[PDB]
Structures are given as structure tokens and as C-alpha cells.
Amino acid sequence: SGFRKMAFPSGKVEGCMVQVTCGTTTLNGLWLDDVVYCPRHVICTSEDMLNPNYEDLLIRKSNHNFLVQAGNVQLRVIGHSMQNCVLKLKVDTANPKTPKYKFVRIQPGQTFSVLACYNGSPSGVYQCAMRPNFTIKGSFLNGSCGSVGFNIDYDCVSFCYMHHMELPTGVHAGTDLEGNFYGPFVDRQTAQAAGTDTTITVNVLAWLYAAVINGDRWFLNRFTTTLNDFNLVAMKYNYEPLTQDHVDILGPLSAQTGIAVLDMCASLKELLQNGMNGRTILGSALLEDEFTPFDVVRQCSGVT
Amino acid sequence: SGFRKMAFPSGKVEGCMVQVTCGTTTLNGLWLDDVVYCPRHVICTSEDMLNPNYEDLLIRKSNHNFLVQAGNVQLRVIGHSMQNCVLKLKVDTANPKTPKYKFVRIQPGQTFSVLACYNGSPSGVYQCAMRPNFTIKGSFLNGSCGSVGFNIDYDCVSFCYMHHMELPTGVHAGTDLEGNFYGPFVDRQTAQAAGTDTTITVNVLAWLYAAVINGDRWFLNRFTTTLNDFNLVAMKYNYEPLTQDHVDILGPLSAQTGIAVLDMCASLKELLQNGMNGRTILGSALLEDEFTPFDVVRQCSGVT
Numbered sequence: 145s146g147f148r149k150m151a152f153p154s155g156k157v158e159g160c161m162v163q164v165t166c167g168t169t170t171l172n173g174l175w176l177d178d179v180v181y182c183p184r185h186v187i188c189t190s191e192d193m194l195n196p197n198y199e200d201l202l203i204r205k206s207n208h209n210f211l212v213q214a215g216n217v218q219l220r221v222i223g224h225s226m227q228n229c230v231l232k233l234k235v236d237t238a239n240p241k242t243p244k245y246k247f248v249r250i251q252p253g254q255t256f257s258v259l260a261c262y263n264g265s266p267s268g269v270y271q272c273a274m275r276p277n278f279t280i281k282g283s284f285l286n287g288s289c290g291s292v293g294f295n296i297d298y299d300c301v302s303f304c305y306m307h308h309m310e311l312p313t314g315v316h317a318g319t320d321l322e323g324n325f326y327g328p329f330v331d332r333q334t335a336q337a338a339g340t341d342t343t344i345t346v347n348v349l350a351w352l353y354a355a356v357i358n359g360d361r362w363f364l365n366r367f368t369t370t371l372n373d374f375n376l377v378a379m380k381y382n383y384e385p386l387t388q389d390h391v392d393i394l395g396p397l398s399a400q401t402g403i404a405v406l407d408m409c410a411s412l413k414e415l416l417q418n419g420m421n422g423r424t425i426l427g428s429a430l431l432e433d434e435f436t437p438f439d440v441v442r443q444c445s446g447v448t
Numbered sequence: 449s450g451f452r453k454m455a456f457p458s459g460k461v462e463g464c465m466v467q468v469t470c471g472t473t474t475l476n477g478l479w480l481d482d483v484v485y486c487p488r489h490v491i492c493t494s495e496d497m498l499n500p501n502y503e504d505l506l507i508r509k510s511n512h513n514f515l516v517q518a519g520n521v522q523l524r525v526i527g528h529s530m531q532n533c534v535l536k537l538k539v540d541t542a543n544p545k546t547p548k549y550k551f552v553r554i555q556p557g558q559t560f561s562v563l564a565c566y567n568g569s570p571s572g573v574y575q576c577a578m579r580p581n582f583t584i585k586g587s588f589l590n591g592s593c594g595s596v597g598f599n600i601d602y603d604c605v606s607f608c609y610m611h612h613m614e615l616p617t618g619v620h621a622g623t624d625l626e627g628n629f630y631g632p633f634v635d636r637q638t639a640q641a642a643g644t645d646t647t648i649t650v651n652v653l654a655w656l657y658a659a660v661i662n663g664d665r666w667f668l669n670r671f672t673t674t675l676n677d678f679n680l681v682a683m684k685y686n687y688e689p690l691t692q693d694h695v696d697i698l699g700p701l702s703a704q705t706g707i708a709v710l711d712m713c714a715s716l717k718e719l720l721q722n723g724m725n726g727r728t729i730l731g732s733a734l735l736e737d738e739f740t741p742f743d744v745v746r747q748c749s750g751v752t
């Protein structure tokens with residue numbers, strides 16, 4: 145029993161983190177086979193950022209301008225190129241610790257683990273969701289850029305996020321490992337800001353099922369609702385509409401608990417309209433939306 | 449910016465997890481140098497548990513009854529012995545991935561990372577506090593016993609927890625790596641139950657400082673309180689008394705924010721007496737007590 149925000153074990157990713165330095169900027173890189181991936185803004189000066197032409201900036205660099213350090217070993221850079229907003233530094237040594245991996249882009253509402261790193265050294269691991277507005281609510285300081293987000297399936301690391309920047313509200317923005325930003329953000333100095341966000345309804349329902357599996361039942365009721373009536377309530381409280389695919393995805397959890405999805409939706413409607421009246425669910429006094437149905441199933445196996 | 453429940457990178461511990469099987473029981477072990485540590489209840493049958501004499505049970509075992517598997521390699525057991533509630537299996541191979549390590553016992557109120565494992569394979573990592581009542585609110589299923597808790601300092605893993613059991617309320621109990629239980633729990637079948645718990649006051653104050661560093665200020669006020677008057681309020685709300693050492697430990701965070709510790713205590717008193725009035729702090733609608741002052745400093749460096 146119990147339910148925690150749990151990250152994937154980070155060792156397979158730790159073995160891939162290196163330090164990349166260009167000029168006076170140091171940040172992190174991801175070393176897979178004979179390529180090190182890092183944010184292209186490593187090549188910028190501060191004044192470069194309010195109007196950078198990266199093609200020009202990169203054409204003025206050579207391999208020797210990039211210092212790559214893996215632990216206490218310098219890696220010789222033998223080529224450089226830019227893929228969208230990431231820099232690919234070819235090095236003369238394949239990482240012997242390269243895991244099986246994939247570069248996957250994730251959807252809003254999906255979760256992943258972040259290995260925060262500084263100076264190529266891992267500092268902490270935590271779980272994050274991609275928000276509907278394509279930001280993440282991370283924990284990142286100066287020097288954390290190039291830290292990555294990932295999921296692990298069997299033996300395979302699916303990398304889905306590289307960290308680039310912090311927005312004015314304190315939330316975070318980055319790219320997939322192809323260098324393509326999540327959301328309408330850019331690696332140049334602008335007034336860019338997070339757009340309006342919404343709550344991930346299917347994840348809240350998943351977490352209510354986690355709570356039932358863990359013995360929190362006080363919010364259940366005998367009522368049901370229709371999908372349409374629920375989604376009228378969702379709209380009013382800035383929750384994302386629930387689809388029939390979401391209902392289908394919640395099928396296993398509904399079967400395990402014996403609580404139909406639209407019955408649980410009637411409970412969520414009551415919670416939105418009434419609040420908790422001083423009670424908690426899984427140790428929270430808010431409705432939590434950063435657990436997917438898969439996160440709940442993986443963690444709550446066989447408690448029944 | 450940002451503030452997350454962050455665990456330590458788990459790779460150094462992943463390299464130490466193995467599977468231990470005795471009879472029909474499989475659980476996890478910790479392989480350091482040429483010793484594998486695991487819960488001694490691995491040698492018990494189900495009926496053994498309501499009244500086990502472990503000295504007798506172990507005197508009836510031999511090395512060949514213990515199957516130890518590190519990944520896909522069987523480790524030959526060449527000795528066995530029992531230290532309090534842990535079993536030490538000497539194997540004929542030193543773990544080449546042994547980190548620098550220590551066995552440290554932690555205090556209630558301190559935090560650590562848990563690497564949940566099944567069948568010797570790491571599944572997830574999360575941060576936990578040792579509660580005042582010596583339980584932990586973990587996330588553990590059948591097969592998770594022998595999973596460990598730890599902190600990492602520079603290159604050194606301080607192991608502080610091995611998992612043994614789940615209590616009736618769904619919280620968890622275990623030992624230090626010397627096999628000595630945290631709290632008044634035993635590895636035999638009893639009606640044992642978690643005792644009354646309390647909130648870790650110094651950690652709540654630390655988290656309020658984290659919130660200030662991250663721009664949540666609405667709960668601040670111009671008032672101060674005395675330590676005595678605060679502790680009268682603490683007693684009423686089942687919070688642990690605040691000591692002058694706690695005040696001293698909060699000194700750096702107080703200096704960084706410019707908010708005297710007893711000023712922050714006056715804010716906490718107001719929050720306990722009034723609630724939050726629909727507001728949140730660092731994304732929570734409850735006062736959070738599983739971050740130590742060191743956790744906050746490590747994570748919130750230089751946001752100022």
C-alpha cells in the first residue's frame with residue numbers, strides 16, 4: 145500500500161550525463177553512442193540572446209571551442225551540428241554506458257522523470273507532468289540546462305525532454321531530443337509567458353481510483369452522471385473535457401475497484417462543487433492531476 | 449525556481465540490488481563488497497511468523513538454501529549469519545559496483561530516498577521522512593522487502609533503512625542496516641500498530657522558507673511571537689515543540705529571506721489557527737513537513 149510521486153530509477157541516465165562548456169557557459173549534455181546532445185544556447189553570449197542568428201553563431205565556432213567532460217575524462221569533439229534547438233557534438237568515443245534508448249515526444253497530460261544535473265553531475269530525480277499549456281512545473285536552477293526527462297520501459301530509456309529555460313511564472317520550458325520546443329516558446333529573449341493552463345481530468349480520475357485502492361472512500365457516492373453532464377461541470381471548473389477514450393483507458397482501474405468510470409465522475413463533480421470539507425485524499429487537500437492511469441496501475445498493482 | 453519532492457539519483461544503489469530466494473520466498477538484498485544484506489524473515493514460512501525463533505530457524509539452513517542472483521548471474525553463498533533482524537550472506541565475489549558507503553541510523557524528522565525494488569530489479573525512487581512515530585509513509589507491495597533507503601553525500605551512500613513490513617494503517621516499518629528496527633515494531637505476527645504521530649514543526653518552517661524563496665508571500669505578517677507562545681500553539685495542534693537548536697538550524701534560511709525565525713513562527717501560528725482560506729503554498733493546500741532545512745537549502749540554492 146501507499147501512493148507516492150515516484151520517479152524511474154535514474155542510473156541508466158546518470159551514465160549518460162556530461163558537462164559541456166563553450167566560452168564562459170557551462171551546462172549539461174547527454175552522451176549517447178558517439179554524440180553529445182545539448183541546448184544550442186550554449187554557444188550564445190548574453191547579448192546574443194535578444195536577437196540570435198544561431199546559424200551565424202555556429203559557423204563561427206570550431207570543435208575546439210567545445211569542452212566536453214565525462215566525469216574526469218575530456219572527450220574529444222570531432223564534429224558539431226545543430227538540429228533545431230539542440231547541438232549535436234560528435235565525439236571520438238562511444239559512451240560504453242549507452243542504454244537502449246529512444247527519442248519520443250510526449251503529449252500534454254503525460255508524466256516523466258527529470259534527472260536534474262549541474263556541471264554534468266546528477267543532483268536529484270523527480271516526477272513531472274507535461275502541462276496542457278506545454279510547460280512543466282520543475283525544480284531547476286542556473287546551470288541545469290541540458291538536464292533531461294525520460295521514461296523507462298523494460299530496459300529502454302525513452303528520452304522526451306531537454307531543459308532550456310524558466311518562464312517568468314517560475315515554470316519551465318524545453319524541447320524534445322530532436323530540439324523541437326514543447327509549446328510556443330523560443331530560445332531567445334522575449335516577453336514569452338506560459339499560456340492559460342487546465343487540469344488534467346483523466347489523471348484526477350486515475351488518482352481517485354488510486355485513493356480507493358488505498359482505502360480512501362469517503363468521496364464515493366451512489367450516483368452516476370452522464371459524460372455530457374460531467375463535461376459541463378468540467379468546463380465550469382477549468383478541467384479538460386473527458387473523452388470516451390479516457391473512459392476506455394480507465395477501464396482496468398474501474399474493473400479493479402468495481403466503480404464505473406461515470407460513477408467516479410459523479411464523485412469528482414461533487415468534489416469540484418463542494419470542496420473536501422476539511423478531509424484529505426492520499427494525503428492531499430487538493431485534487432491531484434500529475435498521475436496518469438498507467439502511473440496508478442504500475443504503482444498500485446495487486447493491492448486490489 | 450520551483451520546489452519538488454526530490455530524491456537522490458539512485459544509480460549507485462541500483463548497482464547493489466540483488467534477488468534473494470529461500471524456499472518459496474523471494475525478496476531483495478543489498479550487495480556491498482562480498483556480503484548481501486536482507487531481512488531475516490526470508491527464512492520463515494508463514495506459520496513460522498506467529499512465533500519464530502530465528503536462531504533455531506537459521507541453524508536448520510545451509511548456504512545452498514540461499515539463491516542469490518545479481519542480474520542474470522548467480523552468486524555463490526559461502527557463509528551466512530544473522531545480525532539482529534538482518535541476514536548477512538557472504539558470497540564469493542565482491543560487488544565491483546560497491547560505492548563508498550556508510551550505515552547510518554537516522555532520526556525522526558529526517559528524510560531519505562527509497563529505491564523500491566522487486567525481484568532484485570529497481571522499480572521506482574521517491575523521497576520519504578522518518579515520522580516521529582518511527583514509521584514511514586512509503587509505497588511498497590508484496591516482494592518489496594529488502595528495498596533500502598539512503599542519502600548521498602558527495603560520493604558516499606549513507607544507507608539508513610531496509611524495508612520489512614507494512615502495518616495495518618498502510619504505513620511502513622523497517623530497520624537500519626544493522627538490523628535494528630526503527631520504533632517498537634518486530635518481525636513476527638502481532639497486533640502491532642503505528643503509535644500516535646505528530647507534525648515535524650522545524651520542517652514545516654523550512655518549507656515556508658522555501659515558499660518565500662519561490663515567491664509565495666501571502667502568509668507572511670508583521671508580527672512576531674515568542675518561542676514559548678508559539679510552542680503553546682504547537683502543542684494544541686499536535687506539532688512537535690520547537691527548540692532553540694531548531695531556530696539555530698533555520699538560521700541560514702532566515703538570513704537568505706530576511707525573515708526572522710520567530711516571525712515565521714507567527715505566520716505558522718496564524719495558518720494553524722485560521723487555515724489557508726482557499727489559498728495554496730508551493731502547490732499544496734496543507735502544511736508540508738517532509739522537507740528538512742537541508743533539503744530546502746540544497747534545492748533552493750541561489751534563487752534568493
Ligand SMILES: *C(=O)[C@H](C[C@@H]1CCNC1=O)NC(=O)[C@H](Cc1cccc(F)c1)NC(=O)c1cc2ccccc2[nH]1
Pocket residue numbers: 171185193284285286287288289290308309310311312316330331332333334449
Ligand atoms: C540553463 O542552465 C538555464 C536554466 C534556468 C535558469 C533558472 N532556472 C532555469 O531553469 N537557462 C537560462 O539561463 C535561459 C537561457 C535562455 C533560454 C531561452 C531564451 C533566453 F532569452 C535565455 N534563460 C532563462 O531561463 C530566463 C531568462 C529570463 C529573463 C527574464 C525573466 C525570466 C527569464 N528566464
Ligand SMILES: *C(=O)[C@H](C[C@@H]1CCNC1=O)NC(=O)[C@H](Cc1cccc(F)c1)NC(=O)c1cc2ccccc2[nH]1
Pocket residue numbers: 145475489497588589590591592593594612613614615616620634635636637638
Ligand atoms: C516483503 O516483501 C513484504 C512487504 C509488505 C508487503 C505489503 N506491503 C509491504 O510493504 N513484507 C511482508 O510480507 C511482511 C512479513 C512480516 C514481517 C514482520 C512480521 C510479520 F508477521 C510478517 N508482513 C507484513 O508486512 C504484514 C502482515 C500483516 C497482517 C495483517 C495486517 C497487516 C500486515 N502486514
